[PDB]
Each structure stands twice: as structure tokens, then as C-alpha cells.
Design a protein around this ligand. Structure first.
Ligand SMILES: COc1ccc(OCc2ccc(COc3c(Cl)cccc3Cl)cc2)c(Cl)c1
Lengths: 235, 262, 272, 68, 53, 235, 68, 59
């Protein structure tokens, strides 16, 4: 017959190979498809949908519907943060379980811009201005509005348009970041402060909640498929 | 001629009447990031004349017994005017440099200094613990450091120095110093020239990086032929180092970084 | 990878052009050829530099690791991926500061009975699973992690030709750094010394992940040991910034040295 | 019946073959009658996420007020 | 030593050099941020990118 | 299927083979390259850069910065050599560790011309004429200027141009020489002598150093990749 | 999708096939979609060492005085 | 103008600092303003231009 020479790699089974194989059920009459609504072509499409962030992971609130609610009040102006977060979308406990974080945990690298949308759920009679901020890594994490205001920030005025979006631009040294907590590929800090204060008239609730949402921008991508730690199996 | 030059950057000018040409490292002149090589999406800051000018670091003195000196970039310039300010206010930073080393003597003096510009100039430590040198020691700033004639292991377990121990003939990194000529360099041989001038483009495996975490270039000065004069066992001539950052662009502005010291 | 120029015949000279004299202070090397200093004949040069191209210099499978598993936790082993566990390939790569290439991995698997007169086992099948930084690491030779639904695995049958797979350029930077003069953290003023401290010259704590190897067969009380020798070959190579080669013995992952600091022998200045 | 597609070259060798010619193409031939036996081509397309990201009846501009 | 953000932590191991790891952690404080549970996983050049909860 | 016949060599693993193999990480989004300065295409480019020669390997000077310094003085003219070397670029202890020698130790054969450049590091007030020589193998190694002057030589006059280059032409019987000390492929001798003498006026140092450099010419090539003895690993 | 290159014949057989024809050519076909799976073509180019050998700003001639 | 002998060498830094800050007392402060590094040799003299940097149109 035709002279052949077997090269190394022969008879192995690479779990990620892409070869042809014989069909065990030949000439099978396959049921044709129908146009079912909601078809998906890329996993990144799912990462671009707003998903609610479990921002309040305090012991009494974590693992309850309260982990999603961050409460505000009509107290006099303060320069202390309403919330603090680290830009580690796949590893920070508050981001790791969102739809975005879930997908990132099936990949080793991520790159791109993100956007955080906040919804004000107070009454119509409530007003206020808030400062949402993003500080690229390398300096002290902002602890006062004075430090936060020096980085990327959006001053949100509450009114008819109930929500406000802050885009966290892709500012990185490496071309891709890792989906694990690693200082070399650290992303920075997200924080919120009161710009003025929440003001309500009489006969109106003085405390109300805001909900946060996170999604990927159109320049977001992931690579190196890996296994997630979000699912296990004992015995 | 090959010997007379004038360098003007911003509000600073340098003149020399005894040069030996100038070296442009790898034949590349510093440049800004092109859109096709861009990474961070935010608008960069380019201080231009305020940062791209000649800064004179501290003068060192050459004696018959000197083993050599070293500096790290951008580290040595971290406290230099508005260049240092921009470096600390931004997460990312990029810059090229014009290094001008100065050393004049007389026609009756001898000695030759090898001036090398090394990309990723990693130095050897002093302990049995690997990569143990601490941040504060690795980044001396404008004062830089010195080479030693021999390796001396730090044994104080209670209070380890966590410092470098760069042996001169081993180029401070376990390679023979005579082979350091594969790096962009010039030689200041007292009978020939006053200075050495090197133009360094930005070199890295990324287009932009953290200037506080990473030093791109290292400047090493080694006495190839020791200093000697007439009959004065006693001879000292200063070596002044003037460096100018070029094409500075920073990305990722926030609050200022204040690194831990000493 | 090409030809060298011919030698042109050169006669005597008496001129004001002196290529023999120069000034190395400039930082340049004098580009002289024989005909500049002696009378030469015409020689048609047929030698080429085909074998010294950056590609041909690295086109060899070098051993980077010897992973061992004892099929009687040793029923499985984990190797943190690196090229610094061995010295030969490492020294060649370090002639340059940065590199960019694809990799070909070939696995040579050997096994044997520890006992000369005891035990017996049927042919073994090995599973070499790649665990990218972030994926769950196996705790037992048979826990859920070995399902590899997303991690790439290679199943090798003992006795078959060495297994082999190719890996693309996987760096998060535009090139691999053989040297990194920096830290992964910057200690900030005010924080405890325990804070902001990191290794000098280290980037990510887990750069490329690791390999988890195990024998898939049910272990028999028989004493057996297997070794997987990992060979790696850089293909489609590009390298930047040459550096002098390592002269003294390696002392860890860094440029640290300690022992063989006096590499050169003695030789008389006027001794041929 | 051979299908010749081109590869997306990542790391480039110091060759002109790394930039052009059949050296950056790959060849494919199906050996089985049933399409199930075929390998995956992996030349897969993308689409608009709008069906998920903006399943809104009355289309709105981001610059313009959402609540009008 | 890198603090993945749970501000209320203390890490006491002979780090930045090596030992290796019989490391001690501390959680203060001082509220009942309870359990739940905690795990301790190491990484190794030989087989040991693994440990126990 | 198609009839095939397995030829000898099948299922072997040649460490120097060049075959294709399946990709373990398919469809991976590879980070594009950037134009990094200082790219290298051939190892011979590095062999053409001047590298300092450790000429003074005497017991007190070897393995110190003094191994690179060869001292001269204003003594009356002498016909004895200042230094002596053998043209064994890969094996002579003084050449084996230069950049050129390091590369040659990864190859079994070498061929081509070499050039030695010497730098005068005396004061400007110092003058002198030196004779650098190269004697092809086969006769007695030159021990006086009288014998050296009969071979290839360059008479170096010290002055403004601080350095002088002597090209050692490719004069060989075989088409390639070996990178080991072997008489069959021996290369000859390099030596230096005083032509006149070093002269200095009063108040000037009477002793000074010269440094030597070695690099390959444009007709230099190496072949047969092998392992170097310059790196080892115990246990 | 076959790539046909010619070999650089070293030792020549006493045949005309050793000097011409397809007998001094070799054929190549890529079987994998990922360029990483490809072998090395080894038709690699060279370059000017000047960036290392003469990284000088003001270009100088060897015949002419270096220090001018 | 340098009036030393021909055998004398040296490098000097001439500086100009626009008003508003502390008058330079060390080379370190002076080097941050307009300056010319004078290398002594054949050309015996060196000129430093003090540019017109003013707030008012005339002083
Ligand atoms: C500068 O020099 C370098 C750079 C990177 C390196 O390693 C990067 C690297 C990344 C992932 C894998 C994973 O490869 C594998 C896969 Cl997917 C499946 C099965 C087995 C392996 Cl083995 C292997 C190596 C090395 Cl060894 C040298």
C-alpha cells in the first residue's frame, strides 16, 4: 500500500481535538429546525445584558433578597462612601455571581469596558445628587469624596430618568487581565458618595433603596476556556 | 563634527565640545503610541515641555577604588518636577529618554567608563531567599546604587536587608560584564571624550505600563580602565548624570500615589 | 538564513583612508573585512547562515519537566508550568529579553514495577489535564475536576508513540518577558510592612496555570511508578533585545547567584 | 471535494510564508456521507444582542430621554 | 501577601521570602461574620495544586 | 479504507522533527504583536558585535574586572610579547566566554574571518606604536617581534583614533573548523609587541591599560547545533 | 491547498533528478485550522545587524576618521 | 568667557528662573528652570539667552 510514517501524537486523545468520525446511526431522518425565538450565537451577548449586583453582602443580608438592596437616607451631607468595590469582575464576591461574572469564570482572560447602572427606588418626592467613581489601580483606594472625585466619575442627578450609567473604561497595562485576584492585573476601585444629600418633604419615607446593575460594553472579550469553580460534585 | 553638539529640550540646553557621536538605542527614536498599538481607551495626557526637559540627578565621584554605579528608569526621575507629578497621578505612563553622562578631566588623566543602557536590568539580591529584594531597596531614586567587587550573603535572619548585591564582573546579574557591550552603550575614555549620549526609545512587551511597579531601563556605569592621575594616588573627578524624558503620555488619572519609603 | 558575500580581490594600498584605525568609544563596531587590512583573492562564497537563524537555534525539543506519579495522594500529581525547572532551554531563551512563539509539547511516558518479583497490572492510561489559572485543582485522583468539560485533557495509552499537542501564543502582553524589572504591587505609604510586599521580578502569582497528571486505571496494591517527561519546542519564533548569556550557575527563578562565581580558569597572559 | 480556508496567523515566523501563500491556508475533505461525522468548521458568525439587550417596542436613542 | 478584599483580615506568615506554608490567618472584626466555612488550598511544582476544605 | 504500509521510523520521536499536531486551545484570540525595538533574526548578528576579551587570566586577575585589563608601560623597547593567544574562538579560555565564544559553543563547526579591536586607555599625553600579529598554524609560535612580523600584522600608531582593528583572515585547509581544541583544525597564533615604545612626558602616568574586543566578520558562519558545556545542573 | 517549495540539495546523486524536476521539490499541506498546529516552514529571512553593531546617530564610513 | 589656561577643563550650569518661587540656592533647584550646560574647550565662550517671559507687556 501507500508508505506511511507515524508521527508522535498518534493514538492519543486530545479532549479539544476536532476530527471526523463514523456515524453510528447512518441515513437517519433528522427532524428539521423551526424558528424558535431567542437564539444565541456568542456567549458575549449574554455578558452585555444588565444583571443585578448583590452589593450588600453583610452577614444579615447576604443570601437573601436584601443583598441586592443598598439603602440611602436623607441625612445631612457626608463624605464617606455609600459602597466600595474592586474591579475584579470574576473574583470580587459582589461581581463573581452576576451573569457577567458567571461567564468570566469559564475563561482565563478578560478585556474591555464595563458599565454600572444604578436605579433609584425612592419616592417621586425624593431628590438628590450622587457621585459614582472609578479609580485606576496604583494609589490609595478612595475613602472620601475628595479622593474619588479625582478619578473617573459621573455626577448623578436624580429625577425623571430613574437610572444613571457610569462606564468603567478599559484602562490597563496588559492587553488582557486575569479572571483571578492578582495584583499584576488589578483593575481599580469603584465607589459612591453623596454629592449633596437626599432630600424628602414631610409625609415621605426618609430611607430608600438603589439597585445596581453590571454589563459588558461592545469592546469586551474573553479567552482561554477553563473550568469554573462555581459548580462541584461530591462523590 | 562628531565632537561638538547641542541638545535642546524644552527650556534646557546642553552643549559639548568633546563628544564621540551619540547612540540611538536599537536604532529607534522614542515615539508616542500609535492608534494601531493603543490599549487604554482614555484620552492621554502629554505634558510635553513641562516633563520632556533635562533634569540633572546627583553628581557621583569617581576614585581609583570605584566599582561602578547604576540607576533605574523611570525611578531615578520620580521626584523630578512635573514629570514625577504625572508619574504618580496616573496608573499608566510611557516615556523614552536622552541620557547625557558628563565627565571631564585633563590631558594627564586616564580612565575609561563604560556607559550601558539595559532593558529589564534585573539585579541579583543578597540572601538565599529568591527574589527577596524589597521594593524600597530596588527603587533608590535619583541617588541610584553601586556595584561591588564581591558577593556577600546577608545572614541576619532577624532583620534581613533584602537588598541587591550586584557584583561588578558579573554585571550584577550572573553574566560576564565584558559581554554587556551587546546593550546600547558608549565609552567615556578620558583621552578622547567628555561624555556619552544615548537616546532610548520606550522598550517593553506592552505599549504602556505602570511606572511605579516597573522600571524599563537600567543605566550601568563601570570603570573599564581605573582612574589615574600624574602621581596623585589621590584623584577624584565627578560624574554628573543629566536625563530628559521624551514623548511622555500618561493614562488612567486618579488620586496621587504615595509609595512607601526606606 | 542566507548567503555570505564573496571576497573580492584586493591589492596594495598607500592612502589617506585608514579603516584599521577607529574609536570604539562611539559604541559602534568596526565593520572591517579581510581586504581592508591585507591583500585578498577573489573567493566565491558558498557558505550560508541557514542553521543559525533564530528559528533553527530553537527548533529542538528540550526537557522542561519530569512529572512523577506513583500508582501505589501520589495517585496524581500537579506541575506548575514553567521553563525554569531545567537549565538548558532556559539559558538559550535568556539570550533575549522578549519572545513570541507557538509551542509544541511532546510527552514521553515511562513506567515500571518497583518490585522485581511482585505485583502485576494491566496496561495504563494517563490523563494529562491542563488547569488554566482559576480552574478548580484536583484534590483526589478521582474527584469531579477530572471531568474536563472545559479544560483541555490528553489521554495517553502506555506504549503508544509519545503524545504531542500545539499551544498558540498565550501571553497577556504582546510578547513573553524573560526579564521583568519590577513588582506586581507598589507598597503605599502608611500600610503595614506585611502589606504591599511582593517578589522582585515576579508578575502574576499564577502565570500559565499547571498540569494535573494521573493514571485513570483503578490502582492495584502493586508498587508502580510512572514518569512523564515534558518536552517543549518553540515554533514560529520572534525574539527581541539580546543579552549576554548566563555565566554562573542559576540560583532560583531570578537572576540570583550564589555558588559558581568564578567561571574562568587561569591562563598566562603570554601563553598561547 | 477539498475545502481550502485560510488560518488567522497568531505568532509569525521570520518567513514570508508566515504572511502569505498556501502556507497560511489549511485544507479539508469530508470522508463521510452523514453530516454528523463532520468536524466543526469553526468559521462561526455573530449577531445583534438587541433581542436581549433592548427588547423594546418603541426604539429609543441613548442620547435622547428614555422616558418621554 | 495580597488581601483579596475582606478588609477585616490579618495574615501572619514568613512571606515575601519563603518557608513554606504553615500559615496563620486572623479575622477581626468584630461581628459574627460566620459560617458557612473556609478552605485552604496550596500550589506546587510537583503534584500539589490542591489541598483540603 | 485506503491501503497503507508502515515504514521503519514509524511511532518514533525524533527530537529534531518538524511535523504538525492538534491545537489544545482552539479558536484562541491571540494578542497581536507590537513593534518592539531590537528584534533579532539570526544568531550571527550577535556574533558581529564587539565584546570585551578577558585577556588577563592570571591567578590574581582572573574572575575580577582586572582580567579585562592588559597593562602597558613606558619602558625601553623590548621584543617580548605583550600577550599571546591561540585562534581557538570556542575553546581558548580567553575567547570561549566572549559573546562570540558563547554562541560558537552551541555549534560544532565555524568558518569565517574575525577581527580584534584594541582600545588605548592611557592619557592623551601618551604616545606609542604597537605591532599586532596573526600567524597561521604550522610553524613555531612567535616569541619575538622578529618572528611575528613575518605573518599577518597591523602596525598601530596611537593618537586621536583611540582604537585599532586587526582582521584575522579565513586561512584554513578545511572548509569548516571545529569548536574544540583539535590540531587537525588548529587556527594559529595572535600576539602583540612594542614597535617602538610607549612614551609619556613628566607628570603623566607611566603605566596604562588597553582593552581588547572580538567580533565576527560578514563571512562568518557556524553549523551543526549542539549542546554547550557552559551550563550544567546538579541533581 | 498544497504548497510546493524546492529543497537546497546538498549531496547529489548521479542522477539528473538530483539537479532538476519535482525530484528536488517538496510538498506541504496544512491539516489544521489553527496556525499553532502548523510546522515551521524554515524559509526564514535575515536582516541588517546595524541596530546592534552601529547604533550611531551620525553615520560614519570605515575609511573615514571615526572621531572627526 | 573662560580665561583659564588651555590645560583647564570643566562643565558649568548657567541658569535663569522666572519670578514667583524661591531663588535657587543649589544646582538642584536651578536645573529646574531655563539653563545651558557649558562645556569648556576651544570655543572659549558660552551664551545663555534669558527669554522674554513676563505677565505685563513691558517691565
Ligand atoms: C518564554 O517561554 C515560555 C512561555 C510560556 C510557557 O508556557 C506557557 C503555557 C501556557 C499554557 C500551556 C498549556 O498547554 C497544554 C494544554 Cl493547553 C493541554 C495539555 C498539555 C499542555 Cl502542556 C502550556 C504552556 C513556557 Cl513552557 C515557556
Amino acid at each position: 500500500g501507500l508508505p506511511v510514517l507515524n508521527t508522535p501524537g498518534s493514538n492519543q486523545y486530545l479532549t479539544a481535538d476536532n476530527y471526523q468520525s463514523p456515524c453510528a446511526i447512518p441515513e437517519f431522518d433528522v427532524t428539521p429546525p423551526i424558528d424558535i425565538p431567542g437564539e444565541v450565537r456568542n456567549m458575549m451577548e449574554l455578558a452585555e445584558i444588565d444583571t443585578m449586583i448583590p452589593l450588600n453582602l453583610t452577614n444579615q443580608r447576604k443570601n437573601t433578597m436584601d443583598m441586592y438592596r443598598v439603602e440611602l437616607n436623607d441625612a445631612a451631607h457626608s463624605d464617606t462612601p455609600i459602597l466600595c468595590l474592586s474591579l475584579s469582575p470574576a473574583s470580587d464576591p459582589r461581581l463573581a455571581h452576576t451573569m457577567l461574572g458567571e461567564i468570566l469564570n469559564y475563561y482565563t482572560h478578560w478585556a474591555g469596558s464595563l458599565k454600572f447602572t444604578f436605579l433609584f427606588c425612592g419616592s417621586m418626592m425624593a431628590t438628590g445628587k450622587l457621585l459614582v467613581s472609578y479609580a485606576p489601580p496604583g494609589a490609595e483606594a478612595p475613602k472620601s469624596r475628595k479622593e474619588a472625585m479625582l478619578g473617573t466619575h459621573v455626577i448623578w442627578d436624580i429625577g425623571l430618568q430613574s437610572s444613571c450609567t457610569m462606564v468603567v473604561p478599559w484602562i490597563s497595562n496588559t492587553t488582557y487581565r486575569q479572571t483571578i485576584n492578582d495584583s499584576f492585573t488589578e483593575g481599580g476601585y469603584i465607589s459612591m458618595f453623596y454629592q449633596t444629600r437626599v432630600v424628602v418633604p414631610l409625609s415621605t419615607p426618609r430611607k430608600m433603596d438603589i439597585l445596581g446593575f453590571v454589563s459588558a460594553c461592545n469592546d469586551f472579550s474573553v479567552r482561554l476556556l477553563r473550568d469554573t469553580t462555581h459548580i462541584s460534585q461530591e462523590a | 563634527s562628531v565632537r561638538v553638539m547641542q541638545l535642546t529640550l524644552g527650556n534646557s540646553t546642553i552643549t559639548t565640545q568633546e563628544a564621540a557621536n551619540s547612540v540611538v538605542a536599537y536604532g529607534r527614536w522614542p515615539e508616542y503610541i500609535k492608534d494601531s498599538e493603543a490599549n487604554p481607551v482614555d484620552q492621554p495626557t502629554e505634558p510635553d515641555v513641562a516633563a520632556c526637559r533635562f533634569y540633572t540627578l546627583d553628581t557621583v565621584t569617581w576614585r581609583k577604588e570605584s566599582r561602578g554605579w547604576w540607576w533605574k528608569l523611570p525611578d531615578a526621575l520620580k521626584d523630578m518636577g512635573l514629570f514625577g507629578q504625572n508619574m504618580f497621578y496616573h496608573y499608566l505612563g510611557r516615556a523614552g529618554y536622552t541620557v547625557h553622562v558628563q565627565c571631564n578631566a585633563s590631558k594627564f588623566h586616564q580612565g575609561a567608563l563604560g556607559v550601558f543602557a539595559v532593558p529589564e536590568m534585573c539585579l541579583a539580591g543578597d540572601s538565599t531567599t529568591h527574589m527577596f529584594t524589597k521594593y524600597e531597596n530596588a527603587n533608590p531614586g535619583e541617588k541610584g546604587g553601586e556595584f561591588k567587587g564581591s558577593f556577600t550573603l546577608d545572614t541576619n535572619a532577624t532583620n534581613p536587608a533584602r537588598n541587591f548585591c550586584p557584583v561588578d564582573y558579573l554585571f550584577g546579574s550572573g553574566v560576564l560584564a565584558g559581554n554587556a557591550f551587546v546593550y546600547p552603550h558608549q565609552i567615556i575614555n578620558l583621552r578622547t571624550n567628555n561624555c556619552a549620549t544615548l537616546v532610548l526609545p520606550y522598550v517593553n512587551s506592552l505599549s504602556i505600563d505602570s511606572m511605579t511597579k516597573h522600571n524599563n531601563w537600567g543605566i550601568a556605569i563601570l570603570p573599564l580602565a581605573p582612574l589615574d592621575f600624574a602621581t596623585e594616588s589621590s584623584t577624584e573627578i565627578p560624574i554628573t548624570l543629566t536625563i530628559a524624558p521624551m514623548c511622555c503620555e500618561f493614562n488612567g488619572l486618579r488620586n496621587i500615589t504615595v509609595p512607601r519609603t526606606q | 538564513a542566507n548567503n555570505l558575500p564573496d571576497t573580492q580581490s584586493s591589492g596594495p594600498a598607500h592612502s589617506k583612508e585608514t579603516p584599521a584605525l577607529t574609536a570604539v568609544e562611539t559604541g559602534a563596531t568596526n565593520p572591517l573585512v579581510p581586504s581592508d587590512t591585507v591583500q585578498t583573492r577573489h573567493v566565491i562564497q558558498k557558505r550560508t547562515r541557514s542553521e543559525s537563524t533564530v528559528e533553527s537555534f530553537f527548533a529542538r525539543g528540550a526537557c522542561v519537566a519530569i512529572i512523577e506519579v506513583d500508582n501505589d495522594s501520589k495517585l496524581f500529581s500537579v506541575w506548575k508550568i514553567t521553563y525554569k525547572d531545567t537549565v538548558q532551554l532556559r539559558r538559550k531563551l535568556e539570550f533575549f529579553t522578549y519572545s513570541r512563539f507557538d509551542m509544541e509539547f511532546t510527552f514521553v511516558v515511562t513506567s515500571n514495577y518497583t518490585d522485581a518479583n511482585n505485583g502485576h497490572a494491566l496496561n495504563q492510561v494517563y490523563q494529562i489535564m491542563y488547569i488554566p489559572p482559576g480552574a478548580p485543582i484536583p484534590g483526589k485522583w478521582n474527584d469531579y475536576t477530572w471531568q474536563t468539560s472545559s479544560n483541555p485533557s490528553v489521554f495517553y495509552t502506555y506504549g503508544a508513540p509519545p503524545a504531542r499537542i500545539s499551544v498558540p501564543y498565550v501571553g497577556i502582553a504582546n510578547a513573553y518577558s524573560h526579564f521583568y524589572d519590577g513588582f506586581a504591587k507598589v507598597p503605599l505609604a502608611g500600610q503595614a510592612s506585611t502589606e504591599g510586599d511582593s517578589l522582585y521580578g515576579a508578575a502574576s502569582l499564577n502565570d500559565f496555570g499547571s498540569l494535573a497528571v494521573r493514571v485513570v486505571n483503578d490502582h492495584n496494591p502493586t508498587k508502580l511508578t510512572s514518569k512523564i517527561r515534558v518536552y517543549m519546542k518553540p515554533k514560529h519564533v520572534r525574539v527581541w533585545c539580546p543579552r549576554p548569556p548566563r555565566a554562573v550557575p542559576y540560583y532560583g527563578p531570578g537572576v540570583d547567584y550564589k555558588d559558581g562565581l568564578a567561571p574562568l580558569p587561569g591562563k598566562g597572559l603570554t601563553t598561547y | 471535494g477539498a475545502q481550502v480556508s485560510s488560518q488567522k496567523v497568531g505568532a509569525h515566523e521570520n518567513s514570508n510564508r508566515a504572511y502569505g501563500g498556501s502556507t497560511i491556508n489549511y485544507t479539508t475533505i469530508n470522508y463521510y456521507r452523514d453530516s454528523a461525522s463532520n468536524a466543526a468548521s469553526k468559521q462561526d458568525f455573530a449577531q445583534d444582542p438587541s433581542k436581549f439587550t433592548e427588547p423594546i417596542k418603541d426604539v429609543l436613542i441613548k442620547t435622547a430621554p428614555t422616558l418621554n | 501577601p495580597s488581601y483579596s478584599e475582606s478588609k477585616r483580615l490579618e495574615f501572619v506568615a514568613a512571606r515575601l521570602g519563603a518557608e513554606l506554608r504553615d500559615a496563620s490567618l486572623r479575622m477581626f472584626g468584630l461581628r459574627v461574620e460566620d459560617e458557612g466555612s473556609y478552605t485552604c488550598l496550596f500550589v506546587t511544582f510537583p503534584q500539589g495544586s490542591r489541598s483540603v476544605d
